[PDB]
Amino acid sequence: ADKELKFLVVDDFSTMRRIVRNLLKELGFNNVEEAEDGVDALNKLQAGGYGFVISDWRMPNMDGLELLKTIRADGAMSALPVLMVTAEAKKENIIAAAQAGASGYVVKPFTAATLEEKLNKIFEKLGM
Ligand code: BEF
Ligand SMILES: [Mn+2]
């Protein structure tokens, strides 16, 4: 995938944002921004330029499902790759996020390899 692709990592806890950010760096992605919740993420997305979004689920103000539904419902970013990286592991949740339009879904804790696979799987599905 184009290494200049701009990523937006969303999670209410920095620890996870730092993990995702550093992993993207390893894969060759340095154009990466962060966000602490759904609202904060929509704001930055509003500032245009993003081509991929990795997001957590449980977050205050606006959670990950709501954020995914928002992105998908907006014609200016409806096809925006959204990879869910959450600790929510119940199948009723994986179904909800998948049905809402999730590009992928990874459960915490995850390995470096798992993230790369799931990311490459997205790039492959969308021809990136
Ligand atoms: F709070 Be996240 F869903 F890990
Ligand atoms: Mn969280």
Centre of ligand 1 to C-alpha 41, Å, is 15
Whose CA is closest to 84, among 38, 27, 127? 38
Which CATH fold topology does 1-128 show?
Rossmann fold (3.40.50)
Domain residue ranges in the chain? 1-128
Query: What is the spatial distance between Cα 48 and Cα 6, in angstroms, rounded to a whole number?
Result: 10
Query: What is the spatial distance between Cα 74 and Cα 19, in angstroms, rounded to a whole number?
Result: 29
The secondary element (H helix, E strand) that includes residue 119 is: helix 112-126
Centre of ligand 1 to C-alpha 3, Å, is 27
Confirm or reject: Cβ of 13 under 6 Å from ligand 1.
no
Query: What is the spatial distance between Cα 34 and Cα 37, in angstroms, rounded to a whole number?
Result: 10
- Residue minimizing CA distance to atom 3 of ligand 1: 57
User: What three-state secondary structure class fits 48?
Assistant: coil
Centre of ligand 2 to C-alpha 127, Å, is 30
Q: What does the block give as tokens for 82?
A: 């959204």
C-beta separation of 103 from 77 below 8 A = no
